[PDB]
Amino acid sequence: HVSDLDWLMSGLVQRVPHTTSAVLLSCDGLVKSVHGLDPDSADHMAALASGLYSLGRSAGIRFGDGGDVRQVVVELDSTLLFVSTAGSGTCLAVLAGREADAAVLGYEMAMLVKSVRPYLMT
Amino acid sequence: VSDLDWLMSGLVQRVPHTTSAVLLSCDGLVKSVHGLDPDSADHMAALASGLYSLGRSAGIRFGDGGDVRQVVVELDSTLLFVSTAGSGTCLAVLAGREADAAVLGYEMAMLVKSVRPYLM
C-alpha cells in the first residue's frame, strides 16, 4: 500500500525548501512513490539509493558490530542525496541543496518514516 | 608506499576517534592503509570504491559538472567517509560517531591534497 504515497513525498518536499525530489523505494531498487522526478529519473534514483543503502549496511557488517545504517549521504558539487531506511523492505531517497536546513530535513524524514509504517502493515 | 602509510597514520593521529584510513584506486585497489589488517583493507577498498562508483553515477545524473565530493555512511556507532582524491583515487576513513566533524572534514581535505605529490 506504499505505491500511492506520492502525496507524502510531496508533503516532505513542500516542507523543506531546497529539497527537489523524494523517492520511496523497495530496497531492491524499485520506485514505490515519488515526487519531483520523472518516471525514468526515479527508476535511476531508486537503483542508486538501494545500492548505497546495501553497501552502507555491508560496511556496518564487515566493520562495525553489524550496526544498522542510520543514513547514507552523497555530497555532489551542487546538491546532496540522503538515503535512509523507511521501514522493512523500504528506503527513502531525498535530493536537496546544501542550503537545505539539515536539522529540519532530519525531523521531516523521520516523520515521513513513521507515517509510512501503517502502509507496510497494510 | 610506507611513505603513504606514514601519511595515513598522520591523519589518524591528528583526528581523535578515527580508527583507520585507506587510500584506494577508484577501481578498488588498496594503495596504502593505516589501522586495518591487509584483508580488511582490501574489503574497505572494495566497499569504498562501490560507494564512490554509485556516488559518481549520481553526480553524472543529478550533478552539474564536478565529481562526487564525498560519500558518508552513518552507522549506529561509527561513520565511514569516502572522499574523492582525484586521479582515480579515494580516501576512506572510518571513525567512531564521537569524532569532531569540523576537524575530520578539514583534515581529510588536507590529506587528499597532501598525498598528491607522492602520487606523481
How many Cβ atoms are within 10 Å of B66's Cβ, its own excluded? Answer: 11
DSSP A100: S
Q: Across the A/B interface, how many CB contacts are shorter than 8 Å?
A: 104
Cell numbers linked to A115: 507515517
Q: Residue B55 CA to chain centroid, in angstroms? A: 14
Return the closest-CA partner of residue B55 out of A68, A63, A80: A80
Amino acid type, B112: V
A45 contacts in chain B (CB < 8 Å): 61-62
DSSP A21: E
Give CA–CA dist B83/A73, Å, rounded: 12
Contact at CB, A75 and B69, closer than 8 angstroms: yes
Cα dihedral B31, B33, B38, B44 sign = negative
Q: State the CATH number of the domain containing residue B43.
A: 3.30.450.30
Give CA–CA dist B119/B3, Å, rounded: 11
Selecting from A45, A56, A79 the residue whose C-beta is nearest the C-beta of B73 gives A56
Phi, psi dihedrals of residue B43, rounded to the nearest 5°: -70, -40
Contact at CB, B43 and A52, closer than 8 angstroms: no
Selecting from B58, B63, B72 the residue whose C-beta is nearest the C-beta of A48 gives B58
A84 to chain B: closest CA residue: B74
Residue B26 three-state SS: coil
Indicate the number of domains in chain B. Answer: 1
B72 contacts in chain A (CB < 8 Å): 72-73, 75
Cα dihedral B103, B109, B114, B119 sign = positive
- Torsion, Cα of A104, A108, A109, A114 (10° steps): 150
Give CA–CA dist B120/B112, Å, rounded: 13
Contact at CB, A62 and B43, closer than 8 angstroms: yes
A96 to chain B: closest CA residue: B62
* A67 near B CB under 8 A: yes
Selecting from A55, A70, A76 the residue whose C-beta is nearest the C-beta of B51 gives A55
Give CA–CA dist B118/B38, Å, rounded: 21
Domain that holds residue B49: 1-119
Give CA–CA dist B52/B63, Å, rounded: 14
H/E element, B21 = strand B18-25
A69 contacts in chain B (CB < 8 Å): 73-75
Cell numbers linked to A15: 516542507
H/E element, A44 = helix A39-63
Answer for the pair A94, A19: CB distance below 8 angstroms, yes or no: yes
Residue corresponding to grid cell 576517534: B17
Question: Can you spell out the DSSP letters for B69-103?
Answer: -EEEEEESSEEEEEEEEETTEEEEEEEETTS-HHH
The experimental resolution of this structure, in angstroms, equals 2.2
Residue A83 three-state SS: strand
Beta bridge partners, B82, equal B71, B92
Close Cβ partners of A98 (under 8 Å, ≥ 6 residues apart): A18, A79, A80
Q: How far apart are the first and last CA of chain B?
A: 12
Contact at CB, A63 and B51, closer than 8 angstroms: no
How many Cβ atoms are within 10 Å of A4's Cβ, its own excluded? Answer: 10
Close Cβ partners of B102 (under 8 Å, ≥ 6 residues apart): none
